[PDB]
Amino acid sequence: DWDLLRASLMKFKSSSLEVPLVINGERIYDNNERALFPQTNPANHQQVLANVTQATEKDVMNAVKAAKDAKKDWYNLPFYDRSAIFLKAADLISTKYRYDMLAATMLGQGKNVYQAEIDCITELSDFFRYYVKYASDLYAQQPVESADGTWNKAEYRPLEGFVYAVSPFNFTAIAANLIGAPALMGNTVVWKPSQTAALSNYLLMTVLEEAGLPKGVINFIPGDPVQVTDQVLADKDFGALHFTGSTNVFKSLYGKIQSGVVEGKYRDYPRIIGETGGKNFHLVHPSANISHAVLSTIRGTFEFQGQKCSAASRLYLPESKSEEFLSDMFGILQSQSGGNLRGFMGPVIHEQSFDKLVKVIEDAKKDPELEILYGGQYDKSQGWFVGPTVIKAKRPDHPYMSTEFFGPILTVYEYPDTEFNEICDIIDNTYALTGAIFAKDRKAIEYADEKLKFSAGNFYINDKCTGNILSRFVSIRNTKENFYEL
Amino acid sequence: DWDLLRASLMKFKSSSLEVPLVINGERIYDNNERALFPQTNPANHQQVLANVTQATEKDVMNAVKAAKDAKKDWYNLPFYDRSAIFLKAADLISTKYRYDMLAATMLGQGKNVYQAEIDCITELSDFFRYYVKYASDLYAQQPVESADGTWNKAEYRPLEGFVYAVSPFNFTAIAANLIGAPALMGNTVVWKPSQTAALSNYLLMTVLEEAGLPKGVINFIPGDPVQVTDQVLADKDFGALHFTGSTNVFKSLYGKIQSGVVEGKYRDYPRIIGETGGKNFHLVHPSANISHAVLSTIRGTFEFQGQKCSAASRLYLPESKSEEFLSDMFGILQSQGGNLRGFMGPVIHEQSFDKLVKVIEDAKKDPELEILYGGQYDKSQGWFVGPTVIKAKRPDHPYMSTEFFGPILTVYEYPDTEFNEICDIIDNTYALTGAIFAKDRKAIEYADEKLKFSAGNFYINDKCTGNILSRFVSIRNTKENFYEL
Amino acid sequence: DWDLLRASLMKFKSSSLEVPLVINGERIYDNNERALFPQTNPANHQQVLANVTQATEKDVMNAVKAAKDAKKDWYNLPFYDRSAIFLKAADLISTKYRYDMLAATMLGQGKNVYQAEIDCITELSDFFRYYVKYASDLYAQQPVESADGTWNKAEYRPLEGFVYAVSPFNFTAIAANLIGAPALMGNTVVWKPSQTAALSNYLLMTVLEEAGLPKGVINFIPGDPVQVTDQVLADKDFGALHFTGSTNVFKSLYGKIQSGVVEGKYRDYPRIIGETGGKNFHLVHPSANISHAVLSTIRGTFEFQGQKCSAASRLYLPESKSEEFLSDMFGILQSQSGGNLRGFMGPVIHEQSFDKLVKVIEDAKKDPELEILYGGQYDKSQGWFVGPTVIKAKRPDHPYMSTEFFGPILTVYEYPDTEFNEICDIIDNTYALTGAIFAKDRKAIEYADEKLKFSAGNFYINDKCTGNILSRFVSIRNTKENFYEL
Amino acid sequence: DWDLLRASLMKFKSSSLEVPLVINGERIYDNNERALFPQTNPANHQQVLANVTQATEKDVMNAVKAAKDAKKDWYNLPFYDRSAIFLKAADLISTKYRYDMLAATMLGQGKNVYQAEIDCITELSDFFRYYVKYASDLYAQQPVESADGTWNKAEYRPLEGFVYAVSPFNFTAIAANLIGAPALMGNTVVWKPSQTAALSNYLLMTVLEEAGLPKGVINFIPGDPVQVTDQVLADKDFGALHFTGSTNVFKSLYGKIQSGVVEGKYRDYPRIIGETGGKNFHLVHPSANISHAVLSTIRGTFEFQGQKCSAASRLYLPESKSEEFLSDMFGILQSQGGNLRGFMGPVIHEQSFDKLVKVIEDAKKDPELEILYGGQYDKSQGWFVGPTVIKAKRPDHPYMSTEFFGPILTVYEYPDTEFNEICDIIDNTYALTGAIFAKDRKAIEYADEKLKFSAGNFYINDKCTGNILSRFVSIRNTKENFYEL
């Protein structure tokens, strides 16, 4: 068990894998014409895990064409058989390829074994199995004779144009979700994986092919983000963006798409299905179990270096409980594989993130309205290591309470106990994916639950804030037959 | 019945109604400051039915403010009570105001009594009653203790920003749907009705108030379409557009919104919920019952002068059956608020009339077109354009794809053996609806499948004229954990 | 695990806990004005577990007032939040307070660890979790437009008056049921716990408060049973009795309530929801598996000293099987912690019960129509210990076949095999909560199952006789809106 | 139709029917031993419709014995067959006996044909048909092997003791419901009908027998209410009271039963299933549609002379609308088996008549009361009391709470700004039903909530006149275990 994992880690650690494009079922390597991106280990950046072939404009056009050419045979493949491919992929990843997938995700994305397992084995398999179940329900349509005598059927067709999947580094499972949800519903996909998840994502591609995915149904085109995206969006048959990642990248994609829409580039109005996370909050009420709120906040903020769409990054503490909360938290942090380094829970994904977080820490040192209460340690000599960091803001509207850092950085504001209601109001005034209240008093919980209803899509009571899409990839078509002759 | 309808007609005919803005429950008249739009009878355009107050930039700002100020008390009003308002409005329109609403729709929108009844009484009432039923299902969510022991509830909240409803002239019921769907779900609404349905739409507004709609939940702001829209879209709390109307207007609205989005003026990404219709088709297979296909096509194309999002406007006939089909059709057409000899009813306004005249006159000068029937028009009394059938010699001629929004049918005749080819041509080349007439199941199946992307509603042996609530809410999950670390 | 239990037992065993009233969220101690009841260990009665403050007339009036004052804010607290309190209480008792609750129930109510666990952990938590589920179903009402055009909603309101919960010593879980069922449905409660379960019941109260129960929603008023009851029943707003306990106490409560009703003391007709148990039976058919029936009868009669509402206390044996049954049973009994003593399975709850059972045994020795076949041992030198006792009655209508003893005393009647049908008839002629038949022959089972349908609410085939209420605490209110104007 | 009804009326009018007891399926007449009650026509009290045999103490004992003796064969009769009897009775009453039942109810209970039809035909048939449907659902229980491997069934048994049904004069349908609900569930019944509905109730009994009701399952024992009740309640097997009628009679029955319980005469705790009605209210908000509220209040208060458990008898009017409401109401009242000029129909008997006369005459002498309309009465021919409206100057005046069971409305006028206060007064101070008339949703919501304990059925813009099977059974669970220790 541990030996099989060790063996997988050693395989990937001992040489660099050549990661090709996969277009129309065919593996395309650099062949001395295409650029090569070195994917390195975030915990040990001297180690090159893979040399990733980079798609040219021509490659992208070919990927788009492959998707169009595969479309008809794909949506005419019965749902039972389309599903079997994805269930088979889930089983292959859970068994045959379990240790390879774990190792690729650990090494490439900088996760420990438990983080890797929850992501690239469990959650990944869950997406596929659950989508098959939901889809089976959606497709269970029987024709009906209406009261007026007409004979009616409804059918869910895929989108007419192709789907562009743009996936993030942070979860191997999310890449699976982004490509699998549209494909299952009879769509075909051009897929640009994150450069820094290429190893695990390529594995996922090869597993799908082994599971029987037909050529061209999904096309794997890593490359320069701007270059690949501009060429995908140039095609008149672009049907949908399926995206998970940062706000700023989404905004860029959005504006590029709308630009094409208004100037008539597209046959249809493209659908945009994006998730970006936000500045998620933990709100502590004076009645909270402090120990539980502390531990929940540590896990919510610092687990996987805060690199989750749902990660907590701002904390509101009542004044009468601040010292106890903070001293408890600092004590626990102070008392605390693909690679690791003492004083750090794990690495961040790349040098760009590392450099951004360094700026965040160094800027805080020079801001009189900020105070670093704990941490701020960083070291890039071996890997991209940034330590857990806690920064107190003097006012609740300081930029640090709203700027997303995508790292292990917590900004805390302390409010006077009697102004609990006002603090909820402030949160409601000023967008988050998730939020949590820690409290025992039900009237306060009810107040916040109601007041913050527009401030988070998922609200948690006494739990960390880290814890239907199929219908976005189809359109209904009704057929109605009349038997009466005028 | 007829005496009561006659009375309502004679009432609106006698003089002109001053139609005010309705903002935060207050009626705002022109007050010697605002412009007016004279809404006239399209069957008798000398007759001014209403003088419609036109919203200023400041009125629009006040409407937007009213919607914002009414929002919390509206979404906190229990669903039972929000529904009651709309059920009551449907009943008032179906009973107390039935004849006034029929008269307003007949006179203002150029409908005969049967067309008016199906629209402003029946379909309108149905929208409200069915939405209430659908919403009650949506709101039926009970909390559950999951496997892991957490305690979960899900609730649907309204959009945080306001909804801009922009409604068309053609159905009073569509205006009801455009304002009613978002409002029922706890949203508030700024509503610009079509100038040429102002009388019936204003009656709808006043009925909603009588039914108990709270002030500012819906705000009635007719006005210069460009000025009103620009001012509504300038507000940072714009949450959604709910629109039914022409493709060109939708594209203009779409562009104006996306411009604001990318430029950062909106607190949220606005939702765009639009319906534009298209160039809807009837396809006739050689095995069709011809008489039925003829009658279905007449009804689908010419009812209400073709002014329906789903109206048929292109026809594909097989060569072997075309003479019989067309002679039948022409014989039937020949056999056939106000009216004029030779016409079924008027089109809505002079701008439509003039566009249709150009379409007809252009067809007389195009070698690839021939007017086979009709093409008559007269604007001396009302906007009257007669049923018109134009044969195109080429299946991709512009008349086979340009929307004319009028009683004009373009027909292409295909050789019988090329039925599969003509289906392929329809697929290869933007329709809300389409229909095939045929007895042969193999042909029906081929077309049903080939044309699966060519129309959202597909009809077999029927004219092509024949979940939205979820677009106006978003889910929010609450999860409570009991375990202490 | 065993060490954590040991530690809890030692805590409660080493000093006497002062148990206060809890009224409107406030703990009220004796303060040199109120009487104090010593709750002692039934297995070791020299050990004082708690000194229980006793409610005065004034205290009771204040408890009633607290319940009225808390009512509106309680029933307006959304069901989701009311439920969360009870689910949280169940989880706290299953985890944080598991060993304290176990120890309090073992020590105070004279249960071994397994008996305690089934009761105060498992069954208690089950009541709360299951009531939340059932309640969630009851409240899931959607409005509907009827055929006539009217618009209808139905809602379940709590009772208008308060609920008086009177709970027994025998199960900590039953106290939880008695207070929790009405409270969950939006009622408020004045609660008089059994004197001899004060320790465990007080713990349950403190856990509910920790779980977020609002002040005054439940009020904990131990005191003299007659004094407290008379004062509760004096209030015009008395809405319901929720009771589990002996027949004679219920009858007293019933008559006191009806007295007030007929003389107009009450604003409403009070609801009476009581459970009293009865003289439960095991019936053995000649075709029974004798060994299984013997073992089932031992568990059914003697487990927890017969102190269960559902305990077996009368046994009917066919003559041809009597010797084998009885000799088997006597052999098993002869061959056989908060405290214990050899020859005894555990203590009875108090001296009054002990003295009653002594009379039952000593009276049997002098009754020529009775014969003690086994046991009758008793010892009060250390705890209230009464041994398993089996008494043969000469006729099936002897008082011992119908008098409830609430103790480890089994009365047996032997019927001639051919009179099986007649014996069922006799049982049907002469009220039990539970009954069981032991038999293999289906015709006999069918006959008894049918014949005894009025003789027990729960009937068991080849199993010991030891093994919707939410709607009693609400009333439906319909609202109907009409849109047509005359 | 009218000729058939005329014939049934002329039949019962011609002479007097001897109405016997029905005990164990046998008709028992007075036989020169028993007393008689002459049931007369309340519209024409000289006319004796029936001479009703009155049960002796021994007859009552025999009825109780009959119910006990029929019990086992009744509850063992399959539910399919028990139901068939009641479905058949409903059909016989709806067809074969429709005119005789209409005539008996019209003549005996003082109803016009429309009132009689809704009661003794429609509602009566509905009770039986809906109870059968509800019971079939209840009895739909299949056995299940649980998780632990035990094998379980649940069954509903009837009450072990008999049911005493005590039914009122006012609806023939209520008598059907009171005997039918327990009997359908396998119970047997001793039934004392109201003296003043003996004719229609006896017809119901005879139809049930024709429909196949077995002897002794229901026993028909009219008689001295005190003597019969005392003797029924003396029996140790008394299992339940099923009662609809006045508050005072219910309290007397309640006391007599509890006395027996505490004293130990009953084998079981008897179930008491009672309905008494109360002082039902109409509350008018200033935003109400006045015409509709007026017409609803006239119907709610005065239909069948106010002799309904749910009849409106108190009215709260806002000061600003009171003149308009009341003048409308009085104008409408003014515009309006037997009958008499100025009256809508008779009250049931002389005792009611005399009580109502005292109410009216007392109002003329109370400084805080004023008869605004009506107060006319005449007993020379029938028991005729006209619609009467009395204004009270104090909202807690006794006339705002005493049940009069007659065509008397008490009205309190409140200052418009004190609407919330008047709701609070209604809540602070025993009603089956209540109604609010209003357009304003905020006011409706406030009242709907404040008055949640003040009425079991609450109506919005409708008159206040507009699970019981489970009270007549108890669940018994059987569980089989297969594991051997």
Curated annotation (Swiss-Prot), chains B, D:
SUPFAM superfamilies: ALDH-like
Chief localization: mitochondrion
Inducers of expression: By proline and is regulated by a common control element encoded by the PUT3 gene.
A single Gene Ontology CC term: mitochondrial matrix
Catalytic activity: L-glutamate 5-semialdehyde + NAD(+) + H2O = L-glutamate + NADH + 2 H(+)
Gene Ontology MF terms in the entry: 1-pyrroline-5-carboxylate dehydrogenase activity
Name of the molecule in the record: Delta-1-pyrroline-5-carboxylate dehydrogenase, mitochondrial
Species the sequence originates in: Saccharomyces cerevisiae (strain ATCC 204508 / S288c)
